Paper text:
The [name] (hMPV) fusion (F) protein is essential for viral entry and is a key target of neutralizing antibodies and vaccine development. As a class I viral fusion glycoprotein, hMPV F is first translated as a single polypeptide precursor (F0). Three F2/F1 heterodimers then associate into a metastable prefusion trimer that constitutes the active form of the protein.
Furthermore, we introduced an E453Q substitution to MM-4H to generate our best construct, named DS-CavEs2. The affinity of MPE8 Fab to DSx2 and DS-CavEs2 is similar to that of the hMPV F base construct, although it is much weaker than the affinity to RSV F DS-Cav1. Taken together, DS-CavEs2 enhances expression by 10-fold and exhibits high thermostability (Tm 71.8 °C), indicating its potential for vaccine development. There are two F protomers in the asymmetric unit, and DS-CavEs2 also crystallized as a monomer rather than a trimer. Unambiguous electron density was observed for all disulfide bond substitutions (Cys127/Cys153, Cys140/Cys147, Cys110/Cys322, Cys365/Cys463) and the cavity-filling substitution (Ile231). Similar to the DSx2 structure, the two disulfide-bond substitutions at site V did not alter the local conformation.
Author numbering:
A (entry chain B): 19 to 98
B (entry chain F): 103 to 446, 454 to 465
The structure:
């Protein structure tokens, strides 16, 4: 690179860069398949599988409400 | 208006606005089911939505397959304290991506700041880059710069449909590469007499890229980011400028172009960190110094504009703000000249208007 200090204008210009310009957006849609996890239940108390299953059911139910919240926030991104 | 004062944040809002509009289209029942029907017999799909946008569609089925083919038959009779250690460990390994996708979308209210490995693996990142509407030179560059692709992309949550978590990732298409590019920095050049200041400041700071016989100007320098000799630029807040405007970098007074400046009587001390050094505008009211990390403070700087190369000193301080000089090495020129300020409140005007 070459940097030039312009004493007549208290400015610099640095040259020698090669561009990488974002000209567009490519959309990748994902379907993450969790399976019929909400129809499974552990009736025998504390357990490693019970803990993992409750994390999974909990994460599913939380994303549903996160999604709803997003629909109001997307209104504000478009209609402030 | 004043371009540098309005341009930042613009390219970001355009990306979000563009993504949300695509997300709205994907959330329709006809498009969700079309995408779901595309992926019935395969893990990967390409398709054009009703609104015209091309999407690559990817199914991630490890967890669903573990749940269908191992966990369910093993938890017949609704008992989970079974002595199957590999089942519990496999369950924990197979659901961690999902749990990480939920945390990233929950913490960010449905729009992530980047592309995490849980939204997109390296394998999947390479697959999508391969499908981008660009040529081999760009794809080769992008595959060698996946960290930058992740940093400039983002995800948007589509919704939950049954057991199916649907989301979209915007990846940056770097469609134009290796054209000449340069960055302009500036600070207030100000003359002093009778306690009175006569200031000048350039109002065309930022990044410039000569692309396809036409020069483009990116006023918000945060829309561009360097890796070595490469500068990665969002083009959403780009603006064409005439070829002659580069003459402001050798003769601010040229008649071939009305170089944009701001001239006033209110100096603002500041430090403009440049790639190979720093610009330092130091005036009455604040103190400025440069230093090395081994021997303490080098010297106090004189008032006015000083150009400190990143080899003259490792640090520059203005008042109590401390800036780290770059460590890059390069050709450093001082183009000598009488400061135009010493020849003397307008804003973003041609320089010949500052003289009257
Ligand atoms: C699940 O079952 C299938 C066959 O039904 C088997 O190939 C696979 O190894 C099992 N997975 C685990 C993690 O045990
Ligand atoms: C800069 O341009 C002006 C007018 O175009 C001219 O008077 C002046 O001599 C030029 N200076 C240099 C160094 O070219």
């Amino acid at each position: 690179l070459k940097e030039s200090y312009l004493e007549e204008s208290c400015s610099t210009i640095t040259e020698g860069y090669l561009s990488v310009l974002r000209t567009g957006w490519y959309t990748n849609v994902f379907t993450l398949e969790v399976g019929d996890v909400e129809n499974l239940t552990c009736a025998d108390g504390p357990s490693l599988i019970k803990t993992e299953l409750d994390l999974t059911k909990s994460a599913l139910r939380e994303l549903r409400t996160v999604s709803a919240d997003q629909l109001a926030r997307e209104e504000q991104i478009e209609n402030p | 208006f004043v371009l540098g004062a309005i341009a930042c944040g613009v390219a970001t809002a355009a990306a979000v606005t563009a993504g949300v509009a695509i997300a709205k289209c994907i959330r329709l029942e006809s498009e969700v089911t079309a995408i779901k029907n595309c992926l019935k017999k395969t893990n990967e799909c390409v398709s054009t939505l009703g609104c015209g946008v091309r999407v690559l569609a990817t199914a991630v089925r490890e967890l669903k397959d573990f749940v269908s083919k191992n966990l369910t038959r093993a938890i017949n009779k609704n008992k989970c304290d079974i002595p199957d250690l590999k089942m519990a460990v496999s369950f924990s390994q197979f659901n961690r991506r999902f749990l990480n996708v939920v945390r990233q979308f929950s913490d960010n209210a449905g729009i992530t700041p980047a592309i995490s490995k849980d939204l997109m693996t390296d394998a999947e990142l390479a697959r999508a880059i391969s499908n981008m509407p660009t040529s081999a030179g760009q794809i080769k560059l992008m595959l060698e710069n996946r960290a930058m692709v992740r940093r400039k992309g983002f995800g948007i949550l589509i919704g939950v449909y049954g057991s199916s978590v649907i989301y979209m990732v915007q990846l940056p298409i770097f469609g134009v590469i290796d054209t000449p590019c340069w960055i302009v920095k500036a600070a207030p050049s100000c003359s002093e007499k009778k306690g009175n200041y006569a200031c000048l400041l350039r109002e065309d700071q930022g990044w410039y890229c000569q692309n396809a016989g036409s020069t483009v100007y990116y006023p918000c320098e945060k829309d561009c980011e360097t890796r070595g000799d490469h500068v990665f630029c969002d083009t959403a807040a780009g603006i064409n400028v005439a070829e002659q405007s580069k003459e402001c970098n050798i003769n601010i007074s040229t008649t071939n172009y009305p170089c944009k400046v701001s001239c006033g009587r209110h100096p603002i001390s500041m430090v403009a960190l440049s790639p190979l050094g720093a610009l330092v505008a130091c005036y009455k009211g604040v103190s400025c110094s440069i230093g090395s990390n081994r021997v303490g403070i080098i010297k106090q700087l004189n008032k006015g504009c000083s150009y400190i190369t990143n080899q003259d000193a490792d640090t520059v301080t203005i008042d109590n703000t401390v800036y780290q000089l770059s460590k890059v090495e390069g050709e450093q020129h001082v183009i000598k000249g009488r400061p135009v300020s010493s020849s003397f409140d307008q804003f973003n005007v041609a320089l010949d208007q500052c003289f009257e």
